[PDB]
Amino acid sequence: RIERIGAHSHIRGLGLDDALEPRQASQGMVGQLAARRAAGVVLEMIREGKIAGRAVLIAGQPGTGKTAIAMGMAQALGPDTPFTAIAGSEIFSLEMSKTEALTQAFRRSIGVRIKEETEIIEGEVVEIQIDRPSKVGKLTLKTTEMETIYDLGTKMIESLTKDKVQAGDVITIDKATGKISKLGRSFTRARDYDAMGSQTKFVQCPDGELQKRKEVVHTVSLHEIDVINSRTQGFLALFSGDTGEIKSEVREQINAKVAEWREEGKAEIIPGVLFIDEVHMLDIESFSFLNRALESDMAPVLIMATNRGITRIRGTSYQSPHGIPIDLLDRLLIVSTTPYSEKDTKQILRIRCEEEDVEMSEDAYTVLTRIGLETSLRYAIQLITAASLVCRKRKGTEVQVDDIKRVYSLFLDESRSTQYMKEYQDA
Amino acid sequence: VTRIERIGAHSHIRGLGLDDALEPRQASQGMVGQLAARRAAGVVLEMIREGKIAGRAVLIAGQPGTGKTAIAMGMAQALGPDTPFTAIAGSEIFSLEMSKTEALTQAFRRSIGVRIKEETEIIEGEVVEIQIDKVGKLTLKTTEMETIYDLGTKMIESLTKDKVQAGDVITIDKATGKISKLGRSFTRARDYDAMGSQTKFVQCPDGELQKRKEVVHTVSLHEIDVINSRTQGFLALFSGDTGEIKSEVREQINAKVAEWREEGKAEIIPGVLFIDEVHMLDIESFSFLNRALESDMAPVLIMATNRGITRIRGTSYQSPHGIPIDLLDRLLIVSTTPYSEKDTKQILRIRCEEEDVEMSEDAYTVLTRIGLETSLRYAIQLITAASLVCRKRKGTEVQVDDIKRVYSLFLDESRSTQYMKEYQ
Amino acid sequence: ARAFKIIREAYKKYITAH
Amino acid sequence: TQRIASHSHVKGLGLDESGLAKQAASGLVGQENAREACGVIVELIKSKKMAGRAVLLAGPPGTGKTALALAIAQELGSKVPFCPMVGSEVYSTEIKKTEVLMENFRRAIGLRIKETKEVYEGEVTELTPCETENPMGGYGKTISHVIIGLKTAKGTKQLKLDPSIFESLQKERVEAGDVIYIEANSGAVKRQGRCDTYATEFDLEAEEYVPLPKGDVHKKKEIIQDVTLHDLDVANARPQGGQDILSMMGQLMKPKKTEITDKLRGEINKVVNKYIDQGIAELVPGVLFVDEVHMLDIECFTYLHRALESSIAPIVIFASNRGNCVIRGTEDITSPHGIPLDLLDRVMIIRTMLYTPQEMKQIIKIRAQTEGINISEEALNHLGEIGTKTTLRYSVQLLTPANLLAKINGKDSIEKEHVEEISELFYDAKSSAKILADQQ
Amino acid sequence: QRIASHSHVKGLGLDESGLAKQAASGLVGQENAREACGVIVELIKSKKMAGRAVLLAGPPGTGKTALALAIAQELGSKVPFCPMVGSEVYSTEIKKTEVLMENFRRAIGLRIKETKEVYEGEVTELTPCTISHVIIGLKTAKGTKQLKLDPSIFESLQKERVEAGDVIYIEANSGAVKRQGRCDTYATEFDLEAEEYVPLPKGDVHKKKEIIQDVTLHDLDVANARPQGGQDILSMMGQLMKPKKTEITDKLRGEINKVVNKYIDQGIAELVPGVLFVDEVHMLDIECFTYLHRALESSIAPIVIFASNRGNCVIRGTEDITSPHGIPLDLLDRVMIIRTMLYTPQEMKQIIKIRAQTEGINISEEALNHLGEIGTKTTLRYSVQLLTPANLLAKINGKDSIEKEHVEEISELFYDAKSSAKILADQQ
Amino acid sequence: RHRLSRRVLLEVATAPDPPPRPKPVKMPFYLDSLEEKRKRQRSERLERIFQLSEAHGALAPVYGTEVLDFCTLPQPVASPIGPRSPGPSHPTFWTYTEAAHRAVLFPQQRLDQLSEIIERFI
């Protein structure tokens, strides 16, 4: 519940129609029609997942919505489709190489959902008998439609004693493994009613047939598979820090077994997206590897946001556009984002202030758009909450122009601090 | 007879030659000259021994061979051995298991002492009999009295896992922290020919079986290593801790030490962290110190650098003493003026008094002149060199001729560089 | 402590008599 | 013990009820434009609404960045967590650079959690079964309840428990006349040995006989935990105990952080929400003070404005000391304040002014008051004068040695001659720089 | 016995008065340098001065390492000598500072007289008397003896599975029972059985003999670095390695010094200062120098010998600071510098003749003359190399000696450094 | 204090004393050379045991045992869950909530959580 809003929490998805036609200010996305349409096309390509190994780059001026479009795509994609967001600087790890980090990032966005049809029982416990001396017992389960009696076995009795369930509890019995998962308690209480105990809570009993065939599903990423399969350290894929996967003995075997599972129909595929923000940080070797890492059926599509222009590639002295070599840049097609106009910045500020639940006067909007057009958009967005605090401190209702103008003099955006940096502090 | 520590470089510095009013003496306690510098050293030593404020850094700078390290070792000797004095070189923090910052935190915490005091009721006495049926009884004995003790499962398990035997002088306390302290003597020659490594015969204890023992020990604030892992404290005997978990270290050690200070079971005694040749630190460690000195509990710093306007490691910038200005702001610089014709001869005479190298007046004058021409430290080596050359000469007092004989054997840096005209 | 010695002296006599 | 520090005098921002900074209050003086600017972000933090906000304290060295930066922790109070860190702590040998940033980001987000549990204590006097009239066929009576009498310093009361509690007691192997521990909410029963008050003689066995528990037999007191997201993260990351041999690896150092984000989107970060919405825990978003930010590498700066865009992140109070300086890790880049332009575009900069002689004099007076020095009016004036020449640091640092010289010279207050004598024994950066430039 | 490059150097060769001869010890010329070496060798034997350093400066091939090896030889074996190359300091497992620290604690030797005793012989019977004691009968060719054997080591006795018939050791100090195997007379009890059947000891079962062997201080530090035992999982110490792990100054070496001083005061131990030697000091990093020029100022650092094999060059680690001998001026002071100069044709010929008569090759006069003349064109270290293959070819040709037709013909098969440089000027 | 000086050991070599029995109820063949050899070897034996006993207790610990037990806080230093709580009498019990304890999963609890994918993906 309590997860405070962020700078990108306002976008709930690309504001597109059924024909990939971007609307002006729908679903949080304001303006930027061309880039939004391109992102919608690539997303429609994502939800299809019949080709893997493509890439699309979003370039433009700083503060034009690259990461915003990325988050919008992530949100419109929804769950049930792995989406991995990583900064270019995250792969520079000390416990693994750069290529290993890139392989892990790629395989972390490839999901394998194994459909398992396991028959179980689900009913309210009415009575339980267990004769301790092997030990033998019985069980009675009730549902709204029917009841029955069970002659528990030794291992079922052991499991129920480990769970130590009692009458009235609503539980599910896995016929295969015997695992008892209790959802809660039915309308029953008072074990003794004279001993101490916590407050009682009740829930309705299950409906329909007592025993029913339901469908469980286990969705894990290819990275998690290679991980838990890397070595015999028990309960891996969390392990707090460590991945040292081997190329052939594990990775190729995981790929082959996933292909075999897809063949018979256990878990076919669910490709994902790897949004690599600030990809200019990657080293020349990272691009060298990415060249051939995209040439694989298990290579999900990646999205890169670039802010640099004609600048040397990190790790060398080769000038290239987007700070990316023309080798990797040959595959990915680029999308251009147009700088927001006056009415675009104004509506962006309006939506971002309506997201923070702050009311600003009509002149407040005008002055803030003035500031965010003479200055960067991010500063005008940051001035929405700062101005919304002085107003409350003076027991105000909606942000006025005076509050914004005061909080503008209280802070400096990018230029009023460098222009005043005329004291020779340190260098 | 020969100890592990013979005479070294700074061996004649046996203290700080200052009066009760911190007035520097011309020559006292082995130190010479450096009146203002030694007075500043005593002023900082006063606040060291006081231990109220934290984050005091005193920088001593001057020409090479003016007594910066000399004043540092003098302060170290004037300061009692009770307060910690961590002297490290500027290159000791460049560790591979530790970063350039964690090693510095460990060095800081190593200079904060903690005088712990503990009291525990100890039951000690010679075991006479041990019966076991589970329940049993224990017959402890002393030279003064004897008594039976009824045991239980928890005690029987400890008496079995630790193979106590009739006669073992056991030591027990509340919570049964038993120790196989020593063995009886009446069981004469339990080992006729071969004895265990941990076994040793000791006389019967005296007094009553129940005796209150008081133990006091001065552990440094770096004892976090004792609980940084599940080891039994022996991580402090090797590399061990590398991470310095901030949460654990601060929010447990500082709080519990503050609690001990209230219960009276411990008391902090801040020390000193002398970083010799600190100009080898990078801008990272300097910017770290900038904040570290702003902490609640932090020892005082003493630095000895001879760098003028030189480059700061890890950057292309140049600043005084080769360290950033933002750090100089948080320092307290002290001078070390070069020595004159008189102070050089005086310290040379003092150094000769160390190894009992009885020299002549003409030899003293010639050596002082040589040292003023080439270097001070060089003249300190010629003392022992000429002493050894005259010893084989069947003499008893170094002469001017013996000094000149050595002056040609061991050429100085200046003359050595002058002789490099061949260029191989 | 001193009571222990008196108690041992007392024990000696009983055993000596019986 | 106090152990007076360098910033033990700042008690708060010293702002009035209207949000205007007083000329001198709560130890701070001057910097009204800055103490009012960094005061709005205090309310921003107290709102628990925004995530990833940043404010940059950019000024010359010694102007007071750290002074009014940690003072926010005083205004905010100790209840909300405050994680300070210098820019040099990111470089590590066992954890990547960009990861220490994340680890510190989650250490600043606190999560206070409350739980209520009943408790039982006291010597058990008797445990007799309550009879059930042949529930099954004619085999034998049945235990429907168990009457247990617990003795305490307050009184002795008989209580009934369930038959499962009777089975637990029987398998626990306890006897009568000893102290036990029951928790009805969970049902587990713990034992505290026997009663030291009457049960044990002078015997030696350290069975840990607990004295007759003092207080009511039944007691409830809400336990209030204060755990951060980083603490629970490390806990789920470096488990503890003496089982599951994987956990038995207590011989290795195991400093191995870099918590994979799988464990973030999964565990605690999720159960935190499941406890907050359930009404068990209250999130306490804290502050992340990162001074000397100019020390961060280009990779660190790039990751900074990717973690600052996450919905789960605390405020950040940077403190940049360098002017137009080259970014560490790159070449021929002259970004202002030693911070990349891209990141400066995301931070709100608060410019601190340069102290005038009177303000530095007030600061010296306050620091002397804190250290406990009885500086006189002439010594104070001379300190201010000689501090107008150099920086404020050297000026205000000449209070401890001057006081020592005073005490040594039979005095109780720093005089005009004491600071003059100390001013000659020690000098500032500029003097040493000139002396070095004059020499070789 | 594997004739080495410095095997002919057996001493500095000074007279009773301290003057340098053209001694047969293996050194010729270098009168002033050898005199300085002999003057400093007395410092080592004095056992009173610590924290010193001597820099052997001179062009390459002038024999500074030869002077250091002569200093090491003249001392003997009682005092340790630890030759170390400057490049060896750069260890990728542990920081260089601690490497140098440990290196400084290795030269210092320590002699101690332990009058231990052990008992050896065929164990004839074990009678364990809650064990009060266990009597063990050991049989030898000179008789049998019964020993009450400290039941605390009955654990080890059982750990070795020893019983009547086996031949075993046992140390009186700690109980180091060691099973040598079954007795000789019990062999063939089973015509096929995996056993050792060690011969029966011939000496006196009671073996009390003194061991005056010496150990190094760094060895003690290492022995006290990591713990011992497999209490629960501490068995992990017999596994993954322990490469020169860092000790700590505050709690290990201080206690070591304290206990060593205590023992020395009791008259048991005996300290013997060693001599450290660093080859090609110019290879060390500037931080290594910054640590060294302050660590050698302590009161326990042993006398060190520095050898720089080059002149004025940039110090490693700065790339922009030049200093003579590749050593910073700050550290170049406090170090007695001994110059090493070039040789003359006569001295080169004498060195070559010494190497020849040491290797075992007899050479004619006309051959040795040109072989030494080549030492003038080429470096002194080239005729020494050419000498051997000349004798090899001669022996191949039947001629047991070296004539002028061999040394002048083998110089054609191999090229010297200058000739290779001249030919290799084409970059290939 | 009780170093068991040498002469005390020589004196202890005297014949032993008889054991108590508490039950009170109230308020020509001879070889001089062999005897000499046995006496000499017994003296050597006593000297040896004295030497070995004095040589095993001359070293004092660097910290000992009470120092570490004092500095050794409960096994969990800063872990969000509390250590073994012997009872309610000590503050440490009323400091850690069980809800916070459920927030940290031990490795076997991770096994219980992952059993399904452990079975169907390894």
Ligand SMILES: Nc1ncnc2c1ncn2[C@@H]1O[C@H](COP(=O)(O)OP(=O)(O)O)[C@@H](O)[C@H]1O
């Ligand atoms: N299409 C859009 N709709 C609404 N707001 C936007 C849009 N694009 C950018 N923004 C605003 O701009 C701010 C920062 O944009 P950002 O994603 O950093 O752009 P860039 O990726 O080009 O730097 C966000 O706070 C967001 O509110």
Ligand SMILES: Nc1ncnc2c1ncn2[C@@H]1O[C@H](COP(=O)(O)OP(=O)(O)O)[C@@H](O)[C@H]1O
């Ligand atoms: N005041 C003094 N009294 C005695 N000896 C001194 C004095 N000043 C310097 N020395 C000697 O001169 C040497 C200078 O060494 P060091 O302190 O390393 O130089 P610096 O500190 O200037 O770099 C020391 O070994 C010391 O014995």
Ligand SMILES: Nc1ncnc2c1ncn2[C@@H]1O[C@H](COP(=O)(O)OP(=O)(O)O)[C@@H](O)[C@H]1O
């Ligand atoms: N507003 C203020 N009120 C009182 N003292 C101050 C103030 N600002 C700075 N100081 C003093 O100046 C000293 C150094 O300031 P500091 O904040 O460390 O510099 P910076 O933050 O610029 O690195 C502090 O020890 C503090 O006592």
Ligand SMILES: Nc1ncnc2c1ncn2[C@@H]1O[C@H](COP(=O)(O)OP(=O)(O)O)[C@@H](O)[C@H]1O
């Ligand atoms: N005085 C000498 N007497 C005999 N042989 C010498 C003498 N000086 C040098 N040599 C020979 O010349 C060689 C020089 O090798 P080395 O000592 O490694 O060169 P440097 O020490 O100059 O770097 C040695 O192998 C040695 O046999």
